[PDB]
CSV table of C-alpha atoms in Angstrom, one decimal:
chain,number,residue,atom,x,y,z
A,7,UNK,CA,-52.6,120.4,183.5
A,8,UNK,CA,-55.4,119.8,186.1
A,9,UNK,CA,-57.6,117.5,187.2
A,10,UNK,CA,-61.1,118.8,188.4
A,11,UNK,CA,-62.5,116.4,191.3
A,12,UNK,CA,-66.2,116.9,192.7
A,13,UNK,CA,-66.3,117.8,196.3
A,14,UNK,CA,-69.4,116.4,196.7
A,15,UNK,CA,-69.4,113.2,194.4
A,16,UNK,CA,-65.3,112.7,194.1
A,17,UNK,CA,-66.2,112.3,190.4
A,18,UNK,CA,-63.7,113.6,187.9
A,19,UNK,CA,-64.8,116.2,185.3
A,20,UNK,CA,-64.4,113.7,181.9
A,21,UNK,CA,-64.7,114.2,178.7
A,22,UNK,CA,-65.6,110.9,176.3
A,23,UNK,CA,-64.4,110.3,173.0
A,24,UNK,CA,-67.7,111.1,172.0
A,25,UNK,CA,-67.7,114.8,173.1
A,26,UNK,CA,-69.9,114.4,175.8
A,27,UNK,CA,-68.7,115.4,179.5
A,28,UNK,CA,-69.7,113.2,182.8
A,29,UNK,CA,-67.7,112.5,185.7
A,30,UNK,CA,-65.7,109.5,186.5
A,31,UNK,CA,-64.6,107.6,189.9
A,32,UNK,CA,-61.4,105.8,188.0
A,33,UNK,CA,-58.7,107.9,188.1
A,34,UNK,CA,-56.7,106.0,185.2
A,35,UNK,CA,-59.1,107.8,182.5
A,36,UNK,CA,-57.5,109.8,179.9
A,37,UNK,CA,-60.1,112.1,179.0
A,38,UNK,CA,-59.8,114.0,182.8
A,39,UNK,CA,-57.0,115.6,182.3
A,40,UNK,CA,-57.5,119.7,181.5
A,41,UNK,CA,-55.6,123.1,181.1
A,42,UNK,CA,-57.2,126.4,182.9
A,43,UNK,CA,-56.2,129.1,180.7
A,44,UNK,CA,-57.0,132.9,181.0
A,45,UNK,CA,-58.3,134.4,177.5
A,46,UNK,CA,-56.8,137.8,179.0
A,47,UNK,CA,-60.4,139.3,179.5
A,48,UNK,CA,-61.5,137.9,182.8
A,49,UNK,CA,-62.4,134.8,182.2
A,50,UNK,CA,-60.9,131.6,181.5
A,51,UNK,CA,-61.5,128.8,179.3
A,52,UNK,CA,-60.9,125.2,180.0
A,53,UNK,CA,-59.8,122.6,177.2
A,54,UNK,CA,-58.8,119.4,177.3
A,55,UNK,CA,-55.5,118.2,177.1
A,56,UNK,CA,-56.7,114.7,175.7
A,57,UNK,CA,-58.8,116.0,172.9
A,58,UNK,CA,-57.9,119.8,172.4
A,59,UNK,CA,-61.9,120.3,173.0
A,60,UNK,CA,-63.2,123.3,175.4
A,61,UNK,CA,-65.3,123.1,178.0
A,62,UNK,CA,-68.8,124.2,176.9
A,63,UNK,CA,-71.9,125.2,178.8
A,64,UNK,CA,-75.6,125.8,176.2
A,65,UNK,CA,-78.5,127.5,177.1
A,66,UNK,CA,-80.1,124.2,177.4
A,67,UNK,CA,-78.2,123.7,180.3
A,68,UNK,CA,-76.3,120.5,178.5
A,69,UNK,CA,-72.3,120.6,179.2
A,70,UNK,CA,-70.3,119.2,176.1
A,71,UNK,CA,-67.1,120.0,174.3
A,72,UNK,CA,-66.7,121.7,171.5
A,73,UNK,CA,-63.8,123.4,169.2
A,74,UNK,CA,-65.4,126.2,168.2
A,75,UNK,CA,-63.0,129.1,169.9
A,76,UNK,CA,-65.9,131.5,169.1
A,77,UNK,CA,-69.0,129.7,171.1
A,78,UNK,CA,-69.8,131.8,173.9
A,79,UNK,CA,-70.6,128.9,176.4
A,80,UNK,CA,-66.6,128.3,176.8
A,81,UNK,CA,-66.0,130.9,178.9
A,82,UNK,CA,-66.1,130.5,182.7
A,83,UNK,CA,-65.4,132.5,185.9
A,84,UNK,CA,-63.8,131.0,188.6
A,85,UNK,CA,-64.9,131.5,192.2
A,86,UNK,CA,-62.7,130.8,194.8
A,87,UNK,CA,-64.1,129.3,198.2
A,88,UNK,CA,-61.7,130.4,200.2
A,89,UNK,CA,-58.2,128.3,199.9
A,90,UNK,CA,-60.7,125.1,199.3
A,91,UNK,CA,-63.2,124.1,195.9
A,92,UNK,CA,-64.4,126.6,193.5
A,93,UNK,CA,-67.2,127.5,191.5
A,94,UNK,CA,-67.2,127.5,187.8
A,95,UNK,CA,-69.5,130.0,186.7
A,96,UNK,CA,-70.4,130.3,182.2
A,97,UNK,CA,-69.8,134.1,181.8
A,98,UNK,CA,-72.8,133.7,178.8
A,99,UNK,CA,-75.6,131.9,180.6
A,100,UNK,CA,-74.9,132.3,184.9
A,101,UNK,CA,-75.2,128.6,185.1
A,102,UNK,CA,-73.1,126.9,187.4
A,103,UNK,CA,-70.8,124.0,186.7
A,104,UNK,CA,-72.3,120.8,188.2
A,105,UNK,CA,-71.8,117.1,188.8
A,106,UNK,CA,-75.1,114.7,189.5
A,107,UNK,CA,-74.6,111.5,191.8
A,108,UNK,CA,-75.4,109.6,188.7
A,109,UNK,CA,-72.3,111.1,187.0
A,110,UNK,CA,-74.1,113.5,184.5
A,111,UNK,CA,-72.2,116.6,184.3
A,112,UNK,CA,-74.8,120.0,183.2
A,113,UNK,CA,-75.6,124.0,184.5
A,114,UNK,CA,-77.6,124.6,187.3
A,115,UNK,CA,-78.9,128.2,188.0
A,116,UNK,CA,-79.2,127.3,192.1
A,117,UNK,CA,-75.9,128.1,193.9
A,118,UNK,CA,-76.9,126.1,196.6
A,119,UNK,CA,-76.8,122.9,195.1
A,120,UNK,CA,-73.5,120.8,196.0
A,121,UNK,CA,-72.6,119.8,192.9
A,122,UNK,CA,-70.8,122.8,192.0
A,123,UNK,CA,-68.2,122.9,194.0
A,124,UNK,CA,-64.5,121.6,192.5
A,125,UNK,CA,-61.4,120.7,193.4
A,126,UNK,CA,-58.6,121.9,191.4
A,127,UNK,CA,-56.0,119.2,191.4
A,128,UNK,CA,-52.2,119.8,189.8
A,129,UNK,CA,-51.8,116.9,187.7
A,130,UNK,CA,-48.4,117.9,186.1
């Protein structure tokens, strides 16, 4: 398992017993804790260890969970920055995983905005 830490906010990807995703500054939460797992195509798909929920991205630009295997908004590409963050790119809609200073977690379509960088953190 992983923990996924904003470069530029130190907020932690979350997920809420709710469903909805936002970033968090309190490491103690439960719902932070995810699993990076190939699907053997390319891409990878991250769920949450918490919940079982994957990561989703929607047209809309909205970032939720979900656990429906088939939605095509769960899969993302992974762009290393060198040995440093990465970018998490949804293989369906070319938006960008990002993290706002107020916490809200969505897609973005400009890669030079720097709430898309993350840390990938062993946590186990």
């Amino acid at each position: 398992p992983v923990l996924l830490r904003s470069t530029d906010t130190g907020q932690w990807l979350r997920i809420n017993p709710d469903g909805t995703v936002d970033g968090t500054r309190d490491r103690s939460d439960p719902g932070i804790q995810w699993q990076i797992s190939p699907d053997g195509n390319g891409p990878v798909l991250l769920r949450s260890t918490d919940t079982g929920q994957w990561l989703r991205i929607n047209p809309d630009g909205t970032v939720d969970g979900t656990r429906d295997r088939s939605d095509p908004g769960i899969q993302w590409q992974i762009s290393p920055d060198g040995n440093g963050p990465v970018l998490l790119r949804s293989t369906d809609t070319g938006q960008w995983l990002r993290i706002n200073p107020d916490g809200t977690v969505d897609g973005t379509r400009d890669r030079s905005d720097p709430g898309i960088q993350w840390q990938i953190s062993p946590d186990g």
